[PDB]
Design a protein around this ligand. Structure first.
Ligand SMILES: CNC(=O)C1C=CC(=O)N=C1
Length: 165
């Protein structure tokens, strides 16, 4: 199972870890991807997860988009987890660098409540431009299921734990 996580609340855990490495080690039921509406996994968590699947995640995603059209900001879809997990929950947090409404971050985290346990990144953090401290607060106040957060950056991990209310 998950190891070395610090407990923040009843159901939220956090670790300074690369989510690709965590996924390859744990092989969780669900790994969350920090997706965009097009499921174009170019950079950040999405680029890293997709590269770990040898681009199979992108091939599957393009077929999903060809059939269904784009996701909504705040929405999600369940696809295969390939070599990383049983499933990948592609969740679209608002990209504040693209002027998307930050109020959609709570709607994005609500997708996690459909899964009993998830390995996840902080939504809208990193290249999505939101304040990761705010993302963690929305996570703890929205998600009721067991979420294991992998925070790639050590310095941000330390800041998140030390400032956690
Ligand atoms: C939770 N984030 C991560 O673990 C990342 C993010 C970007 C990346 O390139 N690789 C891993």
């Amino acid at each position: 199972s998950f190891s070395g996580y610090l407990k923040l609340t009843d159901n939220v855990y956090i670790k300074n870890a690369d989510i690709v490495e965590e996924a390859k080690k744990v092989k969780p039921t669900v790994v969350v991807n920090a997706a965009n509406v097009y499921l174009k996994h170019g950079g950040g968590v999405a680029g890293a997860l997709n590269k770990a699947t040898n681009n199979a995640m992108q091939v599957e995603s393009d077929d999903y988009i060809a059939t269904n059209g784009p996701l909504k900001v705040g929405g999600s879809c369940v696809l295969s987890g390939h070599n990383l997990a049983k499933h990948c929950l592609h969740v679209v947090g608002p990209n504040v660098n693209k002027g998307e409404d930050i109020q959609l971050l709570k709607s994005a985290y609500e997708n996690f409540n459909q899964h009993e346990v998830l390995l996840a990144p902080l939504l809208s953090a990193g290249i999505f431009g939101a304040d990761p401290i705010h993302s963690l607060r929305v996570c703890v106040d929205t998600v009721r299921t067991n979420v294991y957060l992998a925070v790639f950056d050590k310095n941000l991990y330390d800041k998140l734990v030390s400032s956690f209310l």
